[PDB]
Swiss-Prot record, chain A:
This is Spike protein S2'. The lineage of its organism: Viruses, Riboviria, Orthornavirae, Pisuviricota, Pisoniviricetes. Residues 1-43 form a coiled coil. It comes from Severe acute respiratory syndrome coronavirus 2. Changing N19K: In strain: Omicron/BA.1, Omicron/BA.2, Omicron/BA.2.12.1, Omicron/BA.2.75, Omicron/BA.4, Omicron/BA.5, Omicron/BQ.1.1, Omicron/XBB.1.5, Omicron/EG.5.1. Subunit of the fusion protein that is processed upon entry into the host cell. Mediates fusion of the virion and cellular membranes by functioning as a class I viral fusion protein. Contains a viral fusion peptide that is unmasked after S2 cleavage. This cleavage can occur at the cell membrane by host TMPRSS2 or during endocytosis by host CSTL. In either case, this triggers an extensive and irreversible conformational change that leads to fusion of the viral envelope with the cellular cytoplasmic membrane, releasing viral genomic RNA into the host cell cytoplasm.
């Protein structure tokens, strides 16, 4: 029980590094590199994945 | 009144000098944009500086 809870929590934490089809998995890079009127196409898909 | 190549940059989210510093539309604009050629009536033979 202890190991199965800990592994599930660790896997939940690890999912934050996934890309989900964006150009990068770092939110600050997304908001700084690209333009505001077209950066939302990455933010929404990242939000859906998380 | 706008120079000819600069008509295409009036759209929301688009960048350009008239867009940057004169008149840019909001990102959620709901309306219609209309333009037509006025060389025959606005341009002057020696140049119009008004």
């Amino acid at each position: 029980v202890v190991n199965q809870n800990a592994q599930a929590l660790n896997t939940l934490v690890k999912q934050l590094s996934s890309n989900f089809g964006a150009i990068s998995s770092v939110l600050n890079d997304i908001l700084s590199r690209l333009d505001p009127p077209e950066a939302e196409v990455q933010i929404d898909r990242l939000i859906t994945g998380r | 009144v706008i120079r000819g190549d600069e008509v295409r940059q009036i759209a929301p989210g688009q960048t350009g000098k008239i867009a940057d510093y004169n008149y840019k539309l909001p990102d959620d604009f709901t309306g219609c944009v209309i333009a037509w050629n006025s060389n025959n009536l606005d341009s002057k033979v020696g140049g119009n500086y008004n």
